[PDB]
Design a binder for this molecule. Structure first.
Ligand code: AQG
Length: 274
């Protein structure tokens, strides 16, 4: 399972935000690194809400999935803190934060080549998970972290990482799942038992829409019931202004789960634009 980190070696600093039933903090970890050298390491601290301790099993399982695998595009888990009654995950601190905020604030300063490079990296991470038959379950721009910005001294591309999915949608309350439309696929709204590898293909299409839409949230103007009726009438998301990926978005967001393309095919589609 996880590595145990003493709270004496952990300092909680600024709050970065809130997840689903969690609070997110920037922290510092005091550790012995390679060659016995003492290090002061920036860490991300995810604390499960005390009013939602019942989700602790799903809270830690979501991080345990990512730790059992090793890949350059997956966020590293350092371990779990020992505070007695608290549930605290200690993860690597990515310096440029989540993709969805980065897309908003750098709206004008992002062309199609930047978005394609990030899309290819996300597709590579999802292909890696698909080859391991591992279901993420919460693919969204919020859960994409920017390790490195694009460098214009070289043209060096940005580098992204995919974080853990958090508390699974199989146990989340109904109202939370419907707030997550259109990231949650239609078959999961009908029955969260339908969580499948095909789920991540749908959510990837929604995340691709986010990347092309400069940080806009799809269907944000619709309330929950209107989000449900969006699936009932089986509508598709509007084509983004930068519409080079609109066909891939709709292909991924197929209402028939069996027809959504494999990430091998998605990558091939992505690579057809250079
Ligand atoms: C000045 C403005 N910036 C951007 C430059 C920052 O403050 C900032 C924020 C976050 C990181 N880093 C980060 N963020 C995560 O989650 C993303 C956050 C989760 C909950 C709230 C929303 C974002 C992470 N998960 C696992 N390792 C993570 N590392 C770096 C910088």
């Amino acid at each position: 399972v996880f590595h145990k980190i003493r709270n004496e070696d952990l300092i909680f600093n600024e709050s970065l935000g809130q997840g689903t039933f969690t609070k997110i903090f920037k922290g510092v970890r005091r550790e012995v690194g390679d060659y016995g050298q003492l290090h002061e390491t920036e860490v991300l601290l995810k604390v499960l809400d005390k009013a939602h301790r019942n989700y602790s099993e799903s809270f830690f399982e979501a991080a345990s999935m990512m730790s059992k695998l090793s890949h350059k595009h997956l966020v590293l888990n350092y371990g779990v803190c020992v505070c007695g009654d608290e549930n605290i995950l200690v993860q690597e601190f990515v310096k440029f934060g989540s993709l969805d905020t980065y897309l908003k604030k750098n709206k004008n300063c992002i062309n199609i080549l930047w978005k394609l490079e990030v899309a290819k990296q996300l597709a590579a991470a999802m292909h890696f998970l698909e080859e391991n038959t591992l279901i993420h379950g919460n693919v969204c721009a919020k859960n994409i972290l920017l390790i490195r910005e694009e460098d214009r001294k070289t043209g060096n591309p940005p580098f992204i990482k995919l974080s853990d999915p958090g508390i699974s949608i199989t146990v989340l309350p109904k109202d939370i799942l419907q707030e997550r439309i259109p990231w949650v696929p239609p078959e999961c709204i009908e029955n969260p038992k339908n969580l499948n590898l095909a789920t991540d293909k749908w959510s990837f299409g929604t995340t691709l829409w986010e990347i092309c839409s400069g940080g806009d949230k799809p269907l944000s103007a619709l309330d929950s019931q209107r989000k449900l009726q969006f699936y009932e009438d089986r509508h598709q998301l509007p084509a983004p202004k930068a519409a080079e990926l609109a066909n891939l978005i709709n292909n991924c967001m197929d209402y028939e789960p069996d027809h959504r393309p494999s990430f091998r095919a998605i990558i091939r589609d992505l690579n057809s634009l250079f």
